[PDB]
RNA sequence: UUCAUCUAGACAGCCGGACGGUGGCCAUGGAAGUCGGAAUCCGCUAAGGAGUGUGUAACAACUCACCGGCCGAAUGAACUA
RNA sequence: GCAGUCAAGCGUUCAUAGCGACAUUGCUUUUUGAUUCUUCGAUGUCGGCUCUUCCUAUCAUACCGAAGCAGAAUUCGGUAA
C-alpha cells in the first residue's frame, strides 16, 4: 500500500458496523474506569496515577479560568 | 383470574398503639403511644395502669396487636 | 468522595439570561397594552425564523412579542380579580400554546384577512399528516433523493450513512463507494401518520409538502375594552 | 537524617510566627466589631443633625441606642417578604434576628456600654479617632437602661 | 426541466480567469462551454479589477446570462479603491486607509434592499461594523467607536 | 440518611396476572409465562387493586435504596416479554469468505453452526437458549432473527453469537467481518 | 516521531528500471489511465488536486516488469510559487530517467484550455534531457482531435514540431485506445534503452 | 460551610428554533464558524458564537452555547473533616 | 543545581512581611546526525566445583489492552513465578 491508505480505505468502504456504539460505551465507562485504578493501585504505579491526576485537575482549572477571563 | 400477593402484616408504631412494656419499673404493664420521637424512641403514657408519661427506646417494650 | 453525574464541558460566548429577561418582557407587554389599542393573540407553533423575520416586515408598523407563555399571561394579569384593562381574563385565558401577542392599532378586519393570506410552505409536519409519498429506488442515493434530474445531482455524501442506518433503519451498504441501498424503500405515504423518523428522512431529502399558516386567537381593542374571538385557521 | 536541630529550630520559629500573627489578627477583628456602638454613636460627628447642641443628656442617648438596636430592619423585613413558602429561611435571616433580640434582652436589663454624655467624654469621643486605649484612658463609658439611665 | 435557471453564484476574483477548476463540478456536466463562460464572466465583472465578487450565471438552455449580485465587501473596498495587490510581489495588503461618509451612506442606499433593518441609520451602522472588520477607517475614525458614537447621535443620516 | 419510607409503583395491563408469594414472581399472559427468584433484595410487595402492585424498603440506606429501580424494571421486563416479546436483528458482513450460518441439531440441542469465518476450517458452535427462537429473515441480505419472552436470554445468546467469532491477531480498522446486533425491538412492534 | 509516521507509507520507486511517467494538467486523465493499465487506488474525480502525491504502478510487457508513475499536476507558475505538490512533480521528471507522457484535454472539463496547455509544455520542454517524450490527447469521444480549427492548429504542430513526440489519442474512460499507447511508450523506451548498451 | 437557581416552573429527558449584512480580512490549488494569522462588529430578537465539537477536496448535514413547548418539586457548584 | 516569569493554596479569612505544589524558560555543542581507534570501567579477600530451595522488581513461553497496528516483523502496557 502506498501514499496514506487507511483513511482511503474508511472512505471506500466504511468502519464496523458496531463501531460508533462501543466508543460511546467506552467514554461512558471511562468514568467508572477511572475510580477503579484509583483504588485497586498499588506500590509506584498508585503514586504515578496520582501524579497524573493531580496535574490533569490543575490544567483544567487553569483552562477554565483562563478562559472566563480572556472571553469577559 | 385474578392477582395473588401476600408476603407480610406487621404491626405498626403509630399514635394509638398499645404497648406492653417489659423491662424497667413499670414491668409487665400496657400504655400507649402518643408521640413519636425518632427510628428508635417514642412516648408512651398509660393512665390506668399506672405507668408514668415517658420517653423510651422501641427496645424496652413490646407492641401488642391492639389499638 | 460520593458517586455523582458530572456535568459537560462547554466553554463557549453566551450565557444564561436570568428573571431580569422576564421582568422587561413583563413591563414591555403592559406598556405596550397601554399603546397600542389593538391586542391579538395568536398562536405561532410551528415557525422557522426566517418567516417571522418576515412577518415581522410585513407587519413593520405594530409590536410583536413572543416571551414565555406563562409571563405574558401574568403581565395581562390572568387572574379573575386582576387586570391592566377591563375584563382581559378572557383573552389572557385564551393563552394555551406558544402565544404570540401582536399590538397593533390600525385595522380591525384587514389584520385579520391578510394574515389568512400569508401561507408559505415548511418542513415534513412531524406532528400532522403528510401527502407526497416518496420512494428511494434501488441505485446509488442522491442529495436531493429522487427529486432532481439524472445528472444533475450529487450522490449523498459518504459520512452520513451511519446515521441514515443506525438512525432512521434504513437498510444500506456501501458496496462500491456511495450509499446505494440494495432494494426501494417507501418512506411516507398519503394520508398517514407521519412519524418523528418518516418527517426526519423527508428533512434529510429535503422535501416540503406542508404548508404554514397563522392561526389567529382572538382580538381585543382596549378602545371598547372588548375582545372579539377568530377562527382564522 | 538530614535534619539535625536547625531545620528544627527554623520550622518552631515559622509556624510559631505564623500562628502568632493570626491570633493577634483575630483579635484585633474581635475589637474592632466588639466597639461599634461606639463607632455608631461617633459618627457623623456625633449625630452632625445635632452637632450644634453639645450635651445629649438623657433621652437623645436613649433614642441613639434604640437606633443603634434597629439600625438593620431594613434587611429584615427585606428577607421576610422574599422568604419563600415551603423553604427554611436563611442562617442570614435566623443569626440576624438571633443578634436582634440578643441586643433587646440587654436593652431591657441595661442597654449599651455607651459613653457618659454628663462630663468632657463628649469631647473626647470626638477627639478619640480609633485606637482601643480611649478606655484604658478617657472612657467613661456608663451603661444606661431603656427608662430612667441610672 | 424546461430550464435549470439557478443562481450558481461562484464568488471569484474578477476580471481574471475564472478558471473551471472550481466550475466543472457545478457546470461541466451540465453541457456548457468553459472558454465562452469565462468571457462572459469577464464581460459582466468587467468593471470590478483585482477584487473578487459574487456573481449569478441564469442557465436558460445553454446561455449562461452572467450577473453580478451586490455585496457589502466588494462596494465597500471597491470604494476605498486602492491599488493593486499581486500574487507575484510581497502579498502582505493590509488596507489601511480612510473611507467617506458619504460613500458609506451611498454604500447603504444601494444595498439598503438586502438588509432587515428598516432604518438607513441601521444600515449605515452594519455597513460600518463592515468596514471595522475590513480595517478601513471612515472619517479618520475607529469604525465601531464612531458607530457607537452614531448609535449615540452622531451622524444625521437621512432616510 | 437511612430513609424511613421508599415505595415504587408497577402498572399491571388488563390481560395478564402477577402471583408473588416469597419473592418468587410469577407472571402469566397472552405469550406463555416466566417466573423470577428475587430472594436476595429484602423488599416487600403489595397489591392495591388488582393493576397496581407498590414495592417498599422500610429503613432502608443508600445501597438498598437503589435496589428498588432495579426490582421495578426486571418486573416491567417480564410483563413486556410476556405481553409482547423481545426480538432482536443481527446482520452479518464480510470482505473476501462469505459465511456460512445454520441451524443444527447435535443430539437433539438445537445449534449455530459458523463456519468460513475469514477462510478458517474452525467450525464454531453456538447452544440456543431454551425459548429463544433463531430465524434467517428473507428478502433482507446476510440477517437473523432471535425472539422470545426473556429479555435476558435473548440479547445473552444474541451476545455471545457476537463473541463467538472476534478477530484476532489483525487490525480491526482494515478487517471488517463478523455478526453485529442492528435492532432491538418488540415481535409485536406497534400497539 | 511525525516523520516517521509519513516516510513508512511513501511508495518505492526505484529510479534505475524501465519507467513511464505521466504528467499534465490538474483535471484526472492521467489517474484514470493509471487506473487502465495497471491496478491501484488512485481515484477518479472531478476536482482539480484529487491526487496531492504521487503513486505507482506495474505491468508486464513482453516478460519484462514496467513501473508506471502518477503526478499530482503543475498549476500555472514559473519557478517559485509553486507548493511542495508540484515540486514533487517536477522533480520526479527531472530525476527519473525514463518516458514521459503529457495528457491533453481537447474538450474543456478541465479549467484550462488548449493555449495554456501548450504555453505550458513549451514552458517545460527543457526539463526534458535524456526521455522520450509523447503527448496524448485524451477524452476523444467528445472532442476528435481532427475537428479541431486552424487557430488550434498552428499550437498543435507546434506541439508536433520537436524531435521528440508523437501525436496520439485516447479515450481512456470508454476504452478505446490505451493498450496502443503503452505499447508505444514501451517500444520507444525499449528501443532507447536497448540501442545505449555500449559495452 | 459558603454561594447560587426555583410554581413568573429550577435540575434530568423528549421535541422545535438556532436568523440577517457575510462566502467578515489576509494567506490557499481550495478551505464558506471548524489547516492557519489577524479577530470579536452591526441588525432583528424570545434567543441564537464573525462559533463547542463531528464532518466534507471545498460546500452540505448534525451537535453544542443560548431561547420556547410538555412533564411537576426541590436542585447545582466549590470547599471543610 | 543555579537564575527569572508565573499562581492554586498561602502567612491555620490578609497575595505582594514571607512561603509557595503543578508549570515554564534559560545553562552544560567538534552547535547540519560531526569527532571520540577508549575498557575514560569498577574490584584485594574472595574466586571456582557440586547441590537445593525461596522472592518478583517478567528475558522467553500462555492470555489480553493500546499504537499509521495493511500483511510480516516490532514497540509500549496488564495478569502471571
Ligand atoms: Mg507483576
Ligand atoms: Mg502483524
Ligand atoms: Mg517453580
Same mark, same amino acid.
Given at each position: 500500500?502506498?501514499?496514506? #491508505?487507511?483513511?482511503?480505505?474508511?472512505?471506500?468502504?466504511?468502519?464496523?458496523?458496531?463501531?460508533?456504539?462501543?466508543?460511546?460505551?467506552?467514554?461512558?465507562?471511562?468514568?467508572?474506569?477511572?475510580?477503579?485504578?484509583?483504588?485497586?493501585?498499588?506500590?509506584?504505579?498508585?503514586?504515578?496515577?496520582?501524579?497524573?491526576?493531580?496535574?490533569?485537575?490543575?490544567?483544567?482549572?487553569?483552562?477554565?479560568?483562563?478562559?472566563?477571563?480572556?472571553?469577559? | 383470574?385474578?392477582?395473588?400477593?401476600?408476603?407480610?402484616?406487621?404491626?405498626?408504631?403509630?399514635?394509638?398503639?398499645?404497648?406492653?412494656?417489659?423491662?424497667?419499673?413499670?414491668?409487665?404493664?400496657?400504655?400507649?403511644?402518643?408521640?413519636?420521637?425518632?427510628?428508635?424512641?417514642?412516648?408512651?403514657?398509660?393512665?390506668?395502669?399506672?405507668?408514668?408519661?415517658?420517653?423510651?427506646?422501641?427496645?424496652?417494650?413490646?407492641?401488642?396487636?391492639?389499638? | 468522595?460520593?458517586?455523582?453525574?458530572?456535568?459537560?464541558?462547554?466553554?463557549?460566548?453566551?450565557?444564561?439570561?436570568?428573571?431580569?429577561?422576564?421582568?422587561?418582557?413583563?413591563?414591555?407587554?403592559?406598556?405596550?397594552?397601554?399603546?397600542?389599542? #389593538?391586542?391579538?393573540?395568536?398562536?405561532?407553533?410551528?415557525?422557522?425564523?426566517?418567516?417571522?423575520?418576515?412577518?415581522?416586515?410585513?407587519?413593520?408598523?405594530?409590536?410583536?412579542?413572543?416571551?414565555?407563555?406563562?409571563?405574558?399571561?401574568?403581565?395581562?394579569?390572568?387572574?379573575?380579580?386582576?387586570?391592566?384593562?377591563?375584563?382581559?381574563?378572557?383573552?389572557?385565558?385564551?393563552?394555551?400554546?406558544?402565544?404570540?401577542?401582536?399590538?397593533?392599532?390600525?385595522?380591525?378586519?384587514?389584520?385579520?384577512?391578510?394574515?389568512?393570506?400569508?401561507?408559505?410552505?415548511?418542513?415534513?409536519?412531524?406532528?400532522?399528516?403528510?401527502?407526497?409519498?416518496?420512494?428511494?429506488?434501488?441505485?446509488?442515493?442522491?442529495?436531493?433523493?429522487?427529486?432532481?434530474?439524472?445528472?444533475?445531482?450529487?450522490?449523498?455524501?459518504?459520512?452520513?450513512?451511519?446515521?441514515?442506518?443506525?438512525?432512521?433503519?434504513?437498510?444500506?451498504?456501501?458496496?462500491?463507494?456511495?450509499?446505494?441501498?440494495?432494494?426501494? #424503500?417507501?418512506?411516507?405515504?398519503?394520508?398517514?401518520?407521519?412519524?418523528?423518523?418518516?418527517?426526519?428522512?423527508?428533512?434529510?431529502?429535503?422535501?416540503?409538502?406542508?404548508?404554514?399558516?397563522?392561526?389567529?386567537?382572538?382580538?381585543?381593542?382596549?378602545?371598547?375594552?372588548?375582545?372579539?374571538?377568530?377562527?382564522?385557521? | 537524617?538530614?535534619?539535625?536541630?536547625?531545620?528544627?529550630?527554623?520550622?518552631?520559629?515559622?509556624?510559631?510566627?505564623?500562628?502568632?500573627?493570626?491570633?493577634?489578627?483575630?483579635?484585633?477583628?474581635?475589637?474592632?466589631?466588639?466597639?461599634?456602638?461606639?463607632?455608631?454613636?461617633?459618627?457623623?460627628?456625633?449625630?452632625?443633625?445635632?452637632?450644634?447642641?453639645?450635651?445629649?443628656?438623657?433621652?437623645?442617648?436613649?433614642?441613639?441606642?434604640?437606633?443603634?438596636?434597629?439600625?438593620?430592619?431594613?434587611?429584615?423585613?427585606?428577607?421576610?417578604?422574599?422568604?419563600?413558602?415551603?423553604?427554611?429561611?436563611?442562617?442570614?435571616?435566623?443569626?440576624?434576628?438571633?443578634?436582634?433580640?440578643?441586643?433587646?434582652?440587654?436593652?431591657?436589663?441595661?442597654?449599651?456600654?455607651?459613653?457618659?454624655?454628663?462630663?468632657?467624654?463628649?469631647?473626647?469621643?470626638?477627639?478619640?479617632?480609633?485606637?482601643?486605649?480611649?478606655?484604658?484612658?478617657?472612657?467613661?463609658?456608663?451603661?444606661?437602661?431603656?427608662?430612667?439611665?441610672? | 426541466?424546461?430550464?435549470?435557471?439557478?443562481?450558481?453564484?461562484?464568488?471569484?476574483?474578477?476580471?481574471?480567469?475564472?478558471?473551471?477548476?472550481?466550475?466543472?463540478?457545478?457546470?461541466?456536466?451540465?453541457?456548457?462551454?468553459?472558454?465562452?463562460?469565462?468571457?462572459?464572466?469577464?464581460?459582466?465583472?468587467?468593471?470590478?479589477?483585482?477584487?473578487?465578487?459574487?456573481?449569478?450565471?441564469?442557465?436558460?438552455?445553454?446561455?449562461?446570462?452572467?450577473?453580478?449580485?451586490?455585496?457589502?465587501?466588494?462596494?465597500?473596498?471597491?470604494?476605498?479603491?486602492?491599488?493593486?495587490?499581486?500574487?507575484?510581489?510581497?502579498?502582505?495588503?493590509?488596507?489601511?486607509?480612510?473611507?467617506?461618509?458619504?460613500?458609506?451612506?451611498?454604500?447603504?442606499?444601494?444595498?439598503?434592499?438586502?438588509?432587515?433593518?428598516?432604518?438607513?441609520?441601521?444600515?449605515?451602522?452594519?455597513?460600518?461594523?463592515?468596514?471595522?472588520?475590513?480595517?478601513?477607517?471612515?472619517?479618520?475614525?475607529?469604525?465601531?467607536?464612531?458607530?457607537?458614537?452614531?448609535?449615540?447621535?452622531?451622524?444625521?443620516?437621512?432616510? | 440518611?437511612?430513609?424511613?419510607?421508599?415505595?415504587?409503583?408497577?402498572?399491571?395491563?388488563?390481560?395478564?396476572?402477577?402471583?408473588?408469594?416469597?419473592?418468587?414472581?410469577?407472571?402469566?399472559?397472552?405469550?406463555?409465562?416466566?417466573?423470577?427468584?428475587?430472594?436476595?433484595?429484602?423488599?416487600?410487595?403489595?397489591?392495591?387493586?388488582?393493576?397496581?402492585?407498590?414495592?417498599?424498603?422500610?429503613?432502608?440506606?443508600?445501597?438498598?435504596?437503589?435496589?428498588?429501580?432495579?426490582?421495578?424494571?426486571?418486573?416491567?421486563?417480564?410483563?413486556?416479554?410476556?405481553?409482547?416479546?423481545?426480538?432482536?436483528?443481527?446482520?452479518?458482513?464480510?470482505?473476501?469468505?462469505?459465511?456460512?450460518?445454520?441451524?443444527?441439531?447435535?443430539?437433539?440441542?438445537?445449534?449455530?453452526?459458523?463456519?468460513?469465518?475469514?477462510?478458517?476450517?474452525?467450525?464454531?458452535?453456538?447452544?440456543?437458549?431454551?425459548?429463544?427462537?433463531?430465524?434467517?429473515?428473507?428478502?433482507?441480505?446476510?440477517?437473523?432473527?432471535?425472539?422470545?419472552?426473556?429479555?435476558?436470554?435473548?440479547?445473552?445468546?444474541?451476545?455471545?453469537?457476537?463473541?463467538?467469532?472476534?478477530?484476532?491477531?489483525?487490525?480491526?480498522?482494515?478487517?471488517?467481518?463478523?455478526?453485529?446486533?442492528?435492532?432491538?425491538?418488540?415481535?409485536?412492534?406497534?400497539? | 516521531?511525525?516523520?516517521?509516521?509519513?516516510?513508512?507509507?511513501?511508495?518505492?520507486?526505484?529510479?534505475?528500471?524501465?519507467?513511464?511517467?505521466?504528467?499534465?494538467?490538474?483535471?484526472?486523465?492521467?489517474?484514470?489511465?493509471?487506473?487502465?493499465?495497471?491496478?491501484?487506488?488512485?481515484?477518479?474525480?472531478?476536482?482539480?488536486?484529487?491526487?496531492?502525491?504521487?503513486?505507482?504502478?506495474?505491468?508486464?510487457?513482453?516478460?519484462?516488469?514496467?513501473?508506471?508513475?502518477?503526478?499530482?499536476?503543475?498549476?500555472?507558475?514559473?519557478?517559485?510559487?509553486?507548493?511542495?505538490?508540484?515540486?514533487?512533480?517536477?522533480?520526479?521528471?527531472?530525476?527519473?530517467?525514463?518516458?514521459?507522457?503529457?495528457?491533453?484535454?481537447?474538450?474543456?472539463?478541465?479549467?484550462?484550455?488548449?493555449?495554456?496547455?501548450?504555453?505550458?509544455?513549451?514552458?517545460?520542454?527543457?526539463?526534458?534531457?535524456?526521455?522520450?517524450?509523447?503527448?496524448?490527447?485524451?477524452?476523444?469521444?467528445?472532442?476528435?482531435?481532427?475537428?479541431?480549427?486552424?487557430?488550434?492548429?498552428?499550437?498543435?504542430?507546434?506541439?508536433?514540431?520537436?524531435?521528440?513526440?508523437?501525436?496520439?489519442?485516447?479515450?481512456?474512460?470508454?476504452?478505446?485506445?490505451?493498450?496502443?499507447?503503452?505499447?508505444?511508450?514501451?517500444?520507444?523506451?525499449?528501443?532507447?534503452?536497448?540501442?545505449?548498451?555500449?559495452?
Amino acid at each position: 500500500p502506498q501514499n496514506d #491508505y487507511i483513511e482511503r480505505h474508511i472512505k471506500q468502504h466504511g468502519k464496523r458496523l458496531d463501531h460508533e456504539e462501543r466508543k460511546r460505551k467506552r467514554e461512558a465507562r471511562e468514568s467508572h474506569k477511572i475510580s477503579e485504578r484509583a483504588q485497586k493501585l498499588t506500590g509506584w504505579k498508585g503514586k504515578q496515577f496520582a501524579k497524573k491526576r493531580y496535574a490533569e485537575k490543575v490544567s483544567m482549572r487553569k483552562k477554565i479560568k483562563a478562559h472566563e477571563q480572556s472571553k469577559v | 383470574t385474578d392477582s395473588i400477593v401476600k408476603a407480610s402484616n406487621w404491626r405498626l408504631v403509630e399514635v394509638g398503639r398499645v404497648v406492653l412494656i417489659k423491662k424497667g419499673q413499670s414491668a409487665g404493664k400496657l400504655a400507649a403511644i402518643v408521640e413519636i420521637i425518632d427510628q428508635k424512641k417514642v412516648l408512651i403514657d398509660g393512665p390506668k395502669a399506672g405507668v408514668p408519661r415517658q420517653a423510651i427506646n422501641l427496645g424496652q417494650v413490646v407492641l401488642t396487636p391492639l389499638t | 468522595p460520593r458517586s455523582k453525574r458530572s456535568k459537560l464541558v462547554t466553554l463557549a460566548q453566551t450565557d444564561k439570561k436570568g428573571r431580569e429577561n422576564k421582568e422587561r418582557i413583563f413591563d414591555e407587554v403592559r406598556e405596550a397594552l397601554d399603546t397600542y389599542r #389593538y391586542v391579538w393573540v395568536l398562536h405561532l407553533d410551528d415557525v422557522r425564523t426566517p418567516v417571522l423575520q418576515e412577518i415581522r416586515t410585513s407587519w413593520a408598523g405594530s409590536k410583536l412579542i413572543m416571551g414565555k407563555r406563562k409571563v405574558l399571561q401574568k403581565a395581562l394579569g390572568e387572574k379573575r380579580e386582576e387586570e391592566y384593562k377591563e375584563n382581559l381574563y378572557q383573552l389572557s385565558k385564551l393563552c394555551s400554546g406558544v402565544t404570540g401577542l401582536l399590538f397593533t392599532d390600525e385595522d380591525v378586519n384587514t389584520v385579520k384577512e391578510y394574515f389568512k393570506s400569508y401561507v408559505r410552505s415548511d418542513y415534513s409536519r412531524p406532528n400532522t399528516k403528510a401527502p407526497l409519498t416518496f420512494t428511494i429506488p434501488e441505485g446509488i442515493v442522491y442529495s436531493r433523493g429522487g427529486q432532481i434530474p439524472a445528472e444533475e445531482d450529487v450522490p449523498m455524501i459518504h459520512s452520513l450513512e451511519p446515521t441514515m442506518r443506525n438512525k432512521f433503519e434504513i437498510p444500506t451498504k456501501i458496496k462500491a463507494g456511495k450509499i446505494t441501498i440494495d432494494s426501494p #424503500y417507501l418512506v411516507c405515504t398519503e394520508g398517514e401518520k407521519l412519524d418523528v423518523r418518516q418527517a426526519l428522512i423527508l428533512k434529510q431529502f429535503g422535501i416540503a409538502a406542508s404548508e404554514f399558516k397563522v392561526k389567529v386567537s382572538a382580538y381585543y381593542d382596549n378602545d371598547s375594552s372588548t375582545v372579539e374571538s377568530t377562527n382564522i385557521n | 537524617h538530614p535534619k539535625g536541630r536547625k531545620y528544627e529550630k527554623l520550622v518552631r520559629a515559622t509556624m510559631r510566627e505564623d500562628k502568632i500573627a493570626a491570633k493577634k489578627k483575630l483579635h484585633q477583628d474581635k475589637r474592632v466589631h466588639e466597639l461599634a456602638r461606639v463607632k455608631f454613636m461617633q459618627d457623623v460627628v456625633n449625630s452632625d443633625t445635632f452637632k450644634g447642641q453639645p450635651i445629649f443628656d438623657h433621652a437623645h442617648t436613649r433614642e441613639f441606642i434604640q437606633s443603634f438596636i434597629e439600625r438593620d430592619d431594613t434587611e429584615l423585613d427585606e428577607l421576610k417578604k422574599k422568604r419563600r413558602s415551603n423553604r427554611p429561611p436563611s442562617n442570614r435571616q435566623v443569626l440576624l434576628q438571633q443578634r436582634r433580640d440578643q441586643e433587646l434582652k440587654e436593652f431591657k436589663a441595661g442597654f449599651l456600654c455607651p459613653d457618659l454624655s454628663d462630663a468632657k467624654n463628649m469631647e473626647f469621643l470626638r477627639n478619640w479617632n480609633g485606637t482601643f486605649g480611649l478606655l484604658n484612658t478617657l472612657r467613661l463609658i456608663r451603661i444606661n437602661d431603656k427608662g430612667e439611665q441610672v | 426541466d424546461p430550464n435549470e435557471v439557478k443562481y450558481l453564484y461562484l464568488r471569484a476574483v474578477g476580471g481574471e480567469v475564472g478558471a473551471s477548476a472550481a466550475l466543472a463540478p457545478k457546470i461541466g456536466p451540465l453541457g456548457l462551454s468553459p472558454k465562452k463562460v469565462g468571457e462572459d464572466i469577464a464581460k459582466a465583472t468587467k468593471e470590478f479589477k483585482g477584487i473578487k465578487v459574487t456573481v449569478q450565471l441564469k442557465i436558460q438552455n445553454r446561455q449562461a446570462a452572467a450577473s453580478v449580485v451586490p455585496s457589502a465587501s466588494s462596494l465597500v473596498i471597491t470604494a476605498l479603491k486602492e491599488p493593486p495587490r499581486d500574487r507575484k510581489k510581497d502579498k502582505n495588503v493590509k488596507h489601511s486607509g480612510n473611507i467617506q461618509l458619504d460613500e458609506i451612506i451611498e454604500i447603504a442606499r444601494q444595498m439598503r434592499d438586502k438588509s432587515f433593518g428598516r432604518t438607513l441609520a441601521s444600515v449605515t451602522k452594519e455597513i460600518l461594523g463592515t468596514a471595522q472588520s475590513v480595517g478601513c477607517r471612515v472619517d479618520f475614525k475607529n469604525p465601531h467607536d464612531i458607530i457607537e458614537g452614531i448609535n449615540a447621535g452622531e451622524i444625521e443620516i437621512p432616510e | 440518611m437511612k430513609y424511613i419510607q421508599t415505595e415504587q409503583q408497577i402498572e399491571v395491563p388488563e390481560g395478564v396476572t402477577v402471583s408473588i408469594k416469597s419473592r418468587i414472581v410469577k407472571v402469566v399472559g397472552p405469550r406463555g409465562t416466566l417466573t423470577k427468584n428475587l430472594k436476595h433484595i429484602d423488599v416487600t410487595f403489595t397489591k392495591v387493586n388488582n393493576q397496581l402492585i407498590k414495592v417498599a424498603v422500610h429503613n432502608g440506606g443508600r445501597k438498598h435504596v437503589a435496589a428498588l429501580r432495579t426490582v421495578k424494571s426486571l418486573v416491567d421486563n417480564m410483563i413486556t416479554g410476556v405481553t409482547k416479546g423481545y426480538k432482536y436483528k443481527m446482520r452479518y458482513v464480510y470482505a473476501h469468505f462469505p459465511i456460512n450460518v445454520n441451524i443444527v441439531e447435535k443430539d437433539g440441542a438445537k445449534f449455530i453452526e459458523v463456519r468460513n469465518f475469514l477462510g478458517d476450517k474452525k467450525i464454531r458452535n453456538v447452544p440456543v437458549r431454551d425459548g429463544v427462537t433463531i430465524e434467517f429473515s428473507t428478502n433482507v441480505k446476510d440477517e437473523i432473527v432471535l425472539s422470545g419472552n426473556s429479555v435476558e436470554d435473548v440479547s445473552q445468546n444474541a451476545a455471545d453469537l457476537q463473541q463467538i467469532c472476534r478477530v484476532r491477531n489483525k487490525d480491526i480498522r482494515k478487517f471488517l467481518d463478523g455478526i453485529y446486533v442492528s435492532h432491538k425491538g418488540f415481535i409485536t412492534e406497534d400497539l | 516521531e511525525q516523520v516517521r509516521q509519513h516516510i513508512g507509507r511513501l511508495p518505492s520507486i526505484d529510479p534505475n528500471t524501465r519507467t513511464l511517467l505521466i504528467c499534465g494538467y490538474p483535471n484526472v486523465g492521467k489517474s484514470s489511465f493509471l487506473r487502465c493499465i495497471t491496478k491501484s487506488d488512485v481515484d477518479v474525480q472531478p476536482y482539480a488536486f484529487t491526487t496531492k502525491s504521487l503513486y505507482v504502478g506495474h505491468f508486464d510487457y513482453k516478460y519484462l516488469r514496467f513501473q508506471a508513475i502518477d503526478t499530482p499536476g503543475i498549476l500555472d507558475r514559473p519557478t517559485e510559487e509553486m507548493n511542495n505538490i508540484e515540486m514533487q512533480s517536477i522533480y520526479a521528471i527531472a530525476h527519473l530517467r525514463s518516458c514521459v507522457l503529457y495528457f491533453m484535454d481537447l474538450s474543456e472539463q478541465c479549467g484550462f484550455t488548449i493555449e495554456a496547455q501548450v504555453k505550458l509544455f513549451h514552458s517545460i520542454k527543457p526539463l526534458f534531457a535524456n526521455k522520450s517524450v509523447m503527448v496524448v490527447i485524451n477524452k476523444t469521444d467528445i472532442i476528435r482531435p481532427e475537428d479541431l480549427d486552424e487557430e488550434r492548429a498552428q499550437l498543435l504542430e507546434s506541439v508536433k514540431e520537436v524531435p521528440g513526440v508523437e501525436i496520439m489519442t485516447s479515450s481512456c474512460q470508454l476504452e478505446e485506445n490505451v493498450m496502443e499507447v503503452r505499447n508505444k511508450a514501451c517500444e520507444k523506451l525499449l528501443a532507447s534503452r536497448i540501442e545505449n548498451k555500449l559495452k
